[PDB]
């Protein structure tokens with residue numbers, strides 16, 4: 001009967017309709033359901049049904065009054081639908097329009113018919129006081145609010161409804177998000193007002209009501225935590241709580257607001273705070289804050305004190321991204337087409353492991369921008385980066401992993417990104433050859449690190465509560481301490497070899513951090529490997545030494 | 549004009565895989581391509597009551613754009629359904645021909661169509677994606693060659709009779725045609741098959757040589773003046789090869805290092821050590837006897853960046869039992885880059901694997917996941933897609949396989 005075509009809808013195979021029972025209700029609420037439903041019945045949204053309908057769904061009343069229905073059982077019984085709008089637009093992706101109207105759609109779900117074969121499963125019952133008389137039975141003929149398929153079937157229906165208008169008006173841009181509609185054009189505001197009134201009529205001819213108080217929304221628009229002005233966008237104001245004690249739940253909500261502020265507030269850092277959630281036992285557990293964590297939140301509080309605005313997108317100008325180091329493994333970036341009007345900002349601090357270096361992190365940061373740029377603008381930006389081609393080319397050529405280097409230009413804005421040290425690719429002549437080794441009994445957890453050199457020196461340092469792996473690093477560390485500026489080390493530890501060959505400049509391990517400081521201070525270091533327990537040169541001697 | 553009933557495996561739902569974000573360039577090419585496919589009845593638009601999704605990508609394979617569908621998840625779930633020539637590796641020349649357009653003449657089971665659903669993404673999630681499903685047999689789905697099989701045998705049966713020694717193997721959208729003929733004769737016999745296929749309405753818009761394929765032997769250096777480090781490296785590499793070849797010895801070579809010697813010190817190669825090294829060079833010539841291919845077990849490819857445009861690979865089903873090993877090299881052409889070379893290598897290995905065993909290997913790729921997911925389509929030309937995962941542990945075995 002309706003002009004809108006229905007979508008076929010089935011239940012999951014082998015499931016039947018909900019048969020949930022109706023709990024008794026206050027006589028005051030029964031009157032509200034009787035009046036709302038006869039008004040809904042008059043409008044064709046629902047229909048009284050015969051006794052043979054074996055299905056039911058509970059209904060309630062709450063506060064004008066509203067009708068509320070619990071379709072959870074039918075929702076568990078209904079087929080899955082194509083998910084709708086998991087992501088939302090990002091205001092930095094939207095393009096400037098001269099005129100923008102926001103249109104809310106009223107009773108949006110109730111304006112769309114529902115598949116006739118499926119309507120039997122929507123049945124609900126208005127209670128009779130004391131069950132003295134049989135209850136009044138109703139079923140839905142439109143998309144019930146709260147049903148699993150209502151959000152998607154309405155959007156599909158709305159798109160097909162909108163199709164005729166958009167063909168006659170190719171210039172106008174129409175966006176659909178939830179029950180709202182966003183219409184924009186670059187026409188004269190009178191002509192744009194004319195086109196807006198036409199669509200309201202075309203929508204009204206399909207049964208969709210539209211704001212009659214001109215257009216209720218006016219700029220700025222408070223939309224999904226944003227603030228949309230005619231020539232700027234920004235986040236809604238962020239409030240960071242002040243508490244003597246912090247629970248896991250309090251921390252998670254705090255990194256959330258900081259994460260949100262990162263898209264326009266340059267310099268937000270959340271690394272030290274987030275590390276507090278490592279154990280993550282329960283949301284109730286109170287986490288002692290860290291001195292590093294308290295400084296991070298303080299610096300974020302200072303940043304949030306000043307306002308920031310982002311700009312909209314013009315496809316005629318280029319896309320540019322700059323990345324600046326923030327230290328302690330954290331990085332920040334801005335994306336812009338005009339030198340100080342930023343489209344968006346962001347952060348990146350993930351280590352991706354226990355030990356990394358700055359060039360690897362910078363390349364990872366470029367990767368996160370590249371993915372985000374494709375999502376938002378469908379293109380990749382030009383990069384202005386604080387690294388020199390000699391630094392990056394040397395790294396990506398020697399790096400074992402394959403990497404894509406976008407076209408970029410060097411910007412000399414310290415701190416520049418540099419390789420703090422470089423191990424030798426060939427052994428060093430005239431340098432002492434240290435044969436290192438370590439050990440620790442797995443049960444006693446006590447151990448020792450020692451060296452044996454070609455010049456004849458030997459040493460053993462004793463070790464407590466360590467593991468075979470940590471001692472192998474300790475032995476390498478010992479040879480860096482007790483050597484001159486040029487040194488050749490020889491180890492039997494594939495674990496230690498892998499960590500040093502990676503050439504990290506930062507680590508979660510104080511030992512590896514100490515080894516890094518020694519490696520920087522030294523001039524030339526060659527690290528070499530030999531199979532253990534095979535009787536090769538000094539490795540046999542140092543093994544015997546630390547074994548005794 | 550008659551469909552073949554297609555069934556998913558018992559208790560298996562259709563694919564629900566994420567569509568990857570695309571650049572505005574690639575979206576526009578997909579929209580043009582699908583608008584014309586819709587005009588020809590090959591696909592149709594679908595509604596919200598279809599929950600299934602299979603990813604689509606735009607590649608070039610040429611100036612004109614092409615659509616590629618990642619039917620990997622549907623292929624696993626269709627599986628079932630219902631022949632590989634062991635001699636295709638033997639032939640001196642093998643040519644690959646794309647015969648995938650032929651599938652578009654065959655209707656698909658109207659019940660199975662829903663599982664072919666695909667989405668053209670939108671930029672910035674502004675609009676819901678454009679959603680289609682297939683009305684005809686899709687390229688890239690394992691069912692399409694299986695359903696078209698009988699028609700293919702009918703069209704080839706003339707040609708096979710006239711040329712009984714030529715071997716023809718079909719894998720997905722491609723025909724592999726092998727001959728021991730001279731190259732000019734091979735290319736002539738290939739053109740006859742193209743014209744035979746084109747005369748019968750199969751449009752067919754790559755020459756390999758498996759005669760030259762081998763498992764590479766392990767190579768040891770030959771130096772005029774050895775050092776302590778060179779012996780240690782050599783003793784390290786031979787120890788690794790001892791896991792594979794049993795006869796390797798290092799006793800004589802390791803004796804030359806006895807004592808606590810400086811790494812840069814020159815160690816003369818004594819006659820007993822030089823014989824052990826020379827003997828170990830001969831053992832590396834003869835391959836392992838226990839390496840056999842189980843059809844049930846999966847093939848696994850590992851790949852190592854060796855620098856200067858060289859990539860080593862190994863294909864295996866169980867550790868240290870290498871069915872094939874090899875090295876890839878591309879002469880730099882001002883566009884050569886790490887992602888381009890890996891993507892070319894991945895395809896070369898996969899083709900080699902398809903000829904030899906008839907299935908693609910599972911790849912361990914030395915690359916960060918998101919970089920691969922971003923850029924792999926810029927150089928992909930093959931019409932299939934292997935499974936892959938991402939190695940994050942660096943190899944210290946890089947030197948050994950070089």
Ligand SMILES: N#Cc1cc(Cl)cc(Oc2cc(CCNC(=O)CCl)ccc2Cl)c1
Nearest residue numbers: 094096097100182183184221223228229230
């Ligand atoms: N509530 C709301 C809302 C949400 C979105 Cl996601 C878009 C929208 O309207 C538009 C915005 C822009 C971006 C530029 N804006 C302006 O020049 C005036 Cl604020 C362009 C077109 C439309 Cl329709 C409204």
